[PDB]
Write an enzyme that holds these catalytic residues in place. Structure first.
Site, PDB file in Angstrom:
ATOM      1  N   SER D 145       0.851  -1.172   0.000  1.00 20.73           N
ATOM      2  CA  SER D 145       0.000   0.000   0.000  1.00 20.73           C
ATOM      3  C   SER D 145       0.894   1.232   0.000  1.00 20.73           C
ATOM      4  O   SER D 145       2.078   1.164   0.342  1.00 20.73           O
ATOM      5  CB  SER D 145      -0.919  -0.008   1.239  1.00 20.73           C
ATOM      6  OG  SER D 145      -1.542   1.253   1.466  1.00 20.73           O
ATOM      7  N   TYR D 158      -2.332  -1.431  10.855  1.00 20.06           N
ATOM      8  CA  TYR D 158      -2.370  -1.657   9.424  1.00 20.06           C
ATOM      9  C   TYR D 158      -1.116  -1.044   8.755  1.00 20.06           C
ATOM     10  O   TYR D 158      -0.453  -1.691   7.943  1.00 20.06           O
ATOM     11  CB  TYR D 158      -3.652  -1.050   8.853  1.00 20.06           C
ATOM     12  CG  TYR D 158      -3.768  -1.059   7.330  1.00 20.06           C
ATOM     13  CD1 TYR D 158      -4.229  -2.172   6.678  1.00 20.06           C
ATOM     14  CD2 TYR D 158      -3.457   0.067   6.569  1.00 20.06           C
ATOM     15  CE1 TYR D 158      -4.344  -2.209   5.299  1.00 20.06           C
ATOM     16  CE2 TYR D 158      -3.577   0.050   5.183  1.00 20.06           C
ATOM     17  CZ  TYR D 158      -4.002  -1.115   4.563  1.00 20.06           C
ATOM     18  OH  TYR D 158      -4.168  -1.214   3.220  1.00 20.06           O
TER      19      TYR D 158
END
Ligand SMILES: NC(=O)c1ccc[n+]([C@@H]2O[C@H](COP(=O)([O-])OP(=O)(O)OC[C@H]3O[C@@H](n4cnc5c(N)ncnc54)[C@H](O)[C@@H]3O)[C@@H](O)[C@H]2O)c1
Ligand SMILES: NC(=O)c1ccc[n+]([C@@H]2O[C@H](COP(=O)([O-])OP(=O)(O)OC[C@H]3O[C@@H](n4cnc5c(N)ncnc54)[C@H](O)[C@@H]3O)[C@@H](O)[C@H]2O)c1
Ligand SMILES: NC(=O)c1ccc[n+]([C@@H]2O[C@H](COP(=O)([O-])OP(=O)(O)OC[C@H]3O[C@@H](n4cnc5c(N)ncnc54)[C@H](O)[C@@H]3O)[C@@H](O)[C@H]2O)c1
Ligand SMILES: NC(=O)c1ccc[n+]([C@@H]2O[C@H](COP(=O)([O-])OP(=O)(O)OC[C@H]3O[C@@H](n4cnc5c(N)ncnc54)[C@H](O)[C@@H]3O)[C@@H](O)[C@H]2O)c1
EC number: 1.1.1.233
Lengths: 263, 263, 263, 263
Positions: D145, D158
């Site tokens: 990401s 995360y």
């Protein structure tokens, strides 16, 4: 003329060189119409393994020639969808302390300013040909280097100008997003362009390639060209302001000489 | 004259500006002898909150003046230990598509080439004054920007040149390590240099500062100057080729406008 | 001088190790009250070159002990201004293919989760002690590595956990800015912690240090500790979410073995 | 055309999700044999727009199940050329200060450790099937990401785990280069996985997507999948340890809200 770039109009600069030649060929193979730009004598001596390239001479040091050659290219293609800015002076000069004004200027003027002028003209042609209207998009791909982010020794002008291109690429991505032009850089590591596996044969350099490149060899031109197809195709429609690094793991690794198989 | 830079000889360029003025002052406060360089009229209008600065005019666009002013500075200091290359044209032009040759050239010539020429002369003076011999080391600190790595809109020449400086800094670090000169960059985020908290008061820009800077404000000059002292002192003897980023978290954050307190 | 951390309450983990010990000592030297945390036997065998450290045992693998030791530390200091999270398992295992669940878990649990747990407790204590109110701010400093960004061979769990800490650092910076806590990482390159100049004496490793580090040597603990003082002081009030890299140019250079003086 | 992955054996995890589903379909389209892995109920509710996927349930939180499901997959494919490690818990928890042990553990265990375990099994199978012998190579592609490098607010577990995966990717690239396995990450920006254009419709989030993404919209799954085909094909034979970032310019731009068209 079928292919992942079917029907696209492309200009590739530095097109007589290893990476540019491979890109011209990959682009013709994928169905693009391609103008190949480089210095006149270099184009005159180059024959492509695929037919249909339109050679147009363009010296990056001549600002008026950059505009004229770009307008000529665009007229002959009937538009512009893709620009690969790959024309560049390569290599080193010696230590930063001894770097002359002349060498600084040559690398900055040809590699950084040459890229800026080519890309500004290409960007304006893309817009004039309909980029950013009716779902139409276009593609600017700069050829940078691992030197855009980390420095080789004894090449401060070349390295500086590669950093210049890195950030030019992001500035262009930001300003041109609204005009439907996606802009990215390709950062090659060592790439053998001799055709002969002789580019990195000097013993000390050869040992360093084994230690510092995870894959333990220099790259080939085709291994860089494949990224120019990928970035240029319609499917890469969310990729902008990025760099694809193609370096056998050079920039990903430290103390590569300590790894099993090398130590 | 006691202090973390006691007995050091320093040149600061861009010394009439917010960051340069704060650096000159921090350096005098920490015991350095300091030459302050900037454009003649800008130096003439600047008075430092600490005494002892040696003002020497130096227009970065004039290559001969860069060498002459550097030799004059070095003669008056009796040597050179520290160079802060902070002189720069700031701000934007408009969209990349409309960026003129004139504006491209001004930013590249002043900000990138000006930094190169200043630093080459400084590096040669450091070596001539004994850097890299008898345990003697020296310090070159470039003032870059968050724009060295990520692009603001509508400033492609400024941004490109900041990338140029980023990689010049690393090239210099690599080539000059053997000469005992440590070279690093300072990458400021938004820094209010008005003295008035009016630099970022335009409403849209003000809202963006709140959303995109984690600390939710522009920086002050002193908050950048403190890093120039840190990099210049003897204790930073293992730090070279690096950037210290001073941006309230701008470059560390995405979707800052979604955070609690802002959304 | 007045110490640059006069009156500040600090906890340093990994305080028996090279970087931690040097940080404890720099901090006491600069006027801080310091709690030194490490494994019990390691603390028991460490004597600091400066007096006044409060030793508190804390095994990073024991979660309940992290909370208890943090509460005890904070009660004794009467608050908390600075946390240096430096405790970590070092070194390698072998090739990724052969990396066992047990080794993976040990590096992740101690180096990543241990850092998270120490920092969450610290951050809570800082807020409870007044951070983010009445102009009061606090400081969390993580000790990462050049391995936070580029990988050494044969240490996948250590390297992964360092990447973990890199992004934990940025997460913390973003979430804690509104609470007046500034959060940054220090990324050391090779640092000799033997006291003896024997850490990198193995011939192949010694040759690689000369080729890959611009400065051509390992760092010393004090050369990392100085950044811990810099980040912790009030002047660093606009620095958050950043990394200061302290590696002799390792991460800034490619083909270091080709430079003049080395080839 | 001949499919660009003709004859290749692939496993895609996270295959019920937006990016995974689009990858499974691109891979089948390009001639690969594909095993699709996700949680049992999620697989049971997914039908692919292309036929031939072999669904195999695999909970990333169950370590024994990761090994069993990988061995079953490899037995059915008769080998393994390509692994796409895309399975992951998404989204946020709240502020770092309030982040519970349970949430931290869930993100780290599933997203980081789950990736490590899947990739170690895959890598072993690739070597057992002939990777690194007779010119044979294989491909491990992680889905990271933009959070691998820069932090969103309120998602520290995360974000940390994404940094973990970034550096695991580079570790793997370094250790597995000698085994003929090339390892890269894909870093998506915001990607709408609803099928409905409703993922980013909340007004404040919608405004932030316009300001912070140069292209001014979320991505679509297919715009990420295309990079998975690119990395997996034989032509990408010099690309390892890299990240291809697919984020509409998010990570390349600062003060996006100030650009013409947005301010
Ligand atoms: O590896 P690689 O393939 O990139 O390196 P390369 O040297 O093989 O290619 C760089 C290309 O840039 C071209 N070039 C250099 N100076 C130029 C100029 N002034 N004007 C136009 N083109 C110029 C070279 O002719 C060459 O073909
Ligand atoms: O924020 P900030 O403090 O960096 O920005 P700033 O604008 O406050 O400072 C930049 C400094 O660079 C100087 N400068 C601009 N052009 C120059 C030139 N041609 N020659 C020498 N100096 C020049 C400016 O006078 C200024 O003092
Ligand atoms: O200095 P440097 O970081 O480069 O290297 P280093 O190995 O000298 O320092 C690392 C420190 O972290 C400590 N540590 C390791 N595991 C721990 C644990 N489980 N609980 C508490 N402390 C632990 C070690 O004792 C050591 O003192
Ligand atoms: O596409 P996108 O990644 O952006 O988002 P996404 O949420 O659409 O895809 C993530 C995928 O990972 C899967 N996943 C989550 N936890 C898992 C687990 N414990 N075991 C196996 N799969 C798991 C989810 O089911 C989902 O299908």
């Amino acid at each position: 003329r079928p292919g992942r770039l079917a029907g696209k109009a492309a200009i590739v600069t530095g097109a007589a060189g290893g990476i540019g030649r491979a890109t011209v060929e990959a682009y013709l193979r994928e169905g693009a119409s391609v103008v190949a730009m480089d210095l006149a004598p270099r184009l005159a001596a180059t024959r492509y393994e695929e037919p249909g390239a339109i050679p147009i001479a363009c010296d990056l040091a001549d600002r008026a020639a950059i505009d004229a050659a770009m307008a000529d290219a665009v007229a002959r293609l009937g538009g512009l969808d893709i620009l690969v800015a790959g024309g560049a002076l390569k290599g080193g000069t010696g230590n930063f302390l001894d770097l002359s004004d002349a060498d600084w200027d040559r690398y900055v003027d040809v590699n950084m300013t040459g890229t800026f002028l080519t890309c500004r003209a290409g960007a304006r042609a893309m817009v004039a040909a309909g980029a950013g209207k009716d779902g139409r998009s276009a593609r600017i791909i700069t050829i940078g280097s691992v030197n855009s982010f980390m420095a080789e020794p004894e090449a401060a002008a070349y390295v500086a100008a590669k950093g210049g291109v890195a950030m030019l690429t992001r500035a262009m991505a930001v300003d041109l997003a609204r005009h439907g032009i996606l802009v990215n850089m390709i950062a090659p590591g060592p790439v053998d362009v001799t055709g002969n596996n002789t580019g990195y044969s000097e013993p000390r350099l050869a040992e360093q390639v084994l230690d510092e490149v995870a894959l333990g060899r220099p790259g080939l031109p085709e291994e860089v060209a494949t990224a120019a197809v990928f970035l240029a195709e319609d499917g890469s429609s969310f990729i902008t302001g990025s760099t694809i690094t193609i370096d056998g793991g050079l920039s990903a690794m430290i103390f590569g000489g300590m790894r099993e198989g090398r130590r």
